[PDB]
């Protein structure tokens, strides 16, 4: 047909080695920009005054970091939530000093990843698949939005978003516990059940299907060669896996519908990680973990400490040391 | 940075030895 139709047909071709799609049209440029900036900043970016106090943190390999300590440092607290594109700086040197690469990377990345999710829907439509893989991915995506966007919004500064580094991640987690007692928050406890249980059910399903592979190979070749790609039939005996697992526990604590079983594997980690993403997102608005400090007292009124009071002494150690030069007034209200 | 200069040779062999192992097994597979 005409030119715009050739193009539309290419963009949405199910024959490209990698599907592009209309979401891909936004995803590709934004991820490329985020990736190139992140790689260059991680190696070469100079120190960044993250907390706005003219106390720059070195995050890059060339300025004395290794893989574990290096990071792209969040933008300055002096900036708060202001948009700080390159063109708003008077010079690249000013932009690097105040942590601009961080804004550029995370905005392009949230955009790119939001479109990655749409792309998963889009291709499943072109293939005639059911559409809800993208729903599963919403759990990890939601989590990234929380640490990179929502938490900075509630607290009023990208300087408190998560750093883009291994040790920077730890910094963010320790400060968080100090300020929100996240360990004592049920949404985070739901996140741990999500991922623990996901790991468990992951090992279980794999162990249980592997346990009931049909002998289709000899002892000298990999069992795996007993499965041929696209084969009409199944290569394990689900009835035997139920027979094993039903007896391991009891007959009805075990799944015998392959569809019910796989739906469960999808829902358990996704739901739990939804909750822990919502946990960061609501602690962003300072609705914090349970507070049981001095909750037990005796007939006279002495405080009888519990394990919650012992946690609180660790929290206090984090509180009083973190960003040690950044507070002038006794309360750390954001 | 005052790093351990034996780290370089440790890292290099950490990579080369097992990688070579794999490459050798793969190539002789493709040739039968």
């Amino acid at each position: 047909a005409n030119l715009w139709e050739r193009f539309c047909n290419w963009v949405t071709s199910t024959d490209n080695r990698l599907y592009v799609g209309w979401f891909g049209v936004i995803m590709i440029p934004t991820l490329l920009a985020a990736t190139i900036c992140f790689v260059i900043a991680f190696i070469a970016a100079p120190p960044v005054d993250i907390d706005g106090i003219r106390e720059p943190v070195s995050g890059s390999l060339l300025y004395g970091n290794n893989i574990i300590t290096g990071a792209v440092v969040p933008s300055s607290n002096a900036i708060g939530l202001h948009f700080y594109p390159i063109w708003e700086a008077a010079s690249l040197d000013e932009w690097l000093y105040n942590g601009g690469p961080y804004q550029l990377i995370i905005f392009h990345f949230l955009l790119g990843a939001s479109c990655y999710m749409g792309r998963q829907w889009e291709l499943s439509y072109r293939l005639g698949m059911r559409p809800w893989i993208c729903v599963a991915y919403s759990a990890p995506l939601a989590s990234a939005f929380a640490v990179f966007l929502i938490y900075p919004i509630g607290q009023g500064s990208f300087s408190d978003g998560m750093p883009l580094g291994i040790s920077g991640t730890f910094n963010f987690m320790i400060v968080f516990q100090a300020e929100h007692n996240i360990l004592m928050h049920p949404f985070h406890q739901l996140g741990v059940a999500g991922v623990f249980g996901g790991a468990l059910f992951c090992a279980m399903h794999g162990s249980l299907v592997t346990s009931s592979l049909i002998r289709e190979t000899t002892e000298t070749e990999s069992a795996n060669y007993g499965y041929k790609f696209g084969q009409e039939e199944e290569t394990y005996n689900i009835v035997a896996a139920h027979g094993y697992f039903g007896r391991l526990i009891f007959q009805y604590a075990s799944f015998n519908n392959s569809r019910s079983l796989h739906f469960f594997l999808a829902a358990w980690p996704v739901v739990g990680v939804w909750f822990t993403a919502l946990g960061i997102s609501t602690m962003a608005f300072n609705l914090n973990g349970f507070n049981f400090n001095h909750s037990v007292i005796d007939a006279k009124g002495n405080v009888i400490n519990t394990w919650a009071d012992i946690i609180n002494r660790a929290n206090l150690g984090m509180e009083v040391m973190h960003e040690r030069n950044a507070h002038n007034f006794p309360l750390d209200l954001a | 940075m005052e790093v351990n200069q034996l780290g370089l040779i440790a890292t290099a062999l950490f990579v080369l030895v097992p990688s070579v192992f794999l490459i050798i097994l793969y190539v002789q597979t493709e040739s039968q």
Binding site: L18, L61 | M1, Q5, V15
Partner: peptide, 30 residues
Amino acid sequence: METITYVFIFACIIALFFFAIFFREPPRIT
């Protein structure tokens, strides 16, 4: 030398991605 070592390893992985996608054993329906 340490910076060079980290960047070299990271660059080999990126090349590994390229070959693993575009030069994979094609999955065929046998």
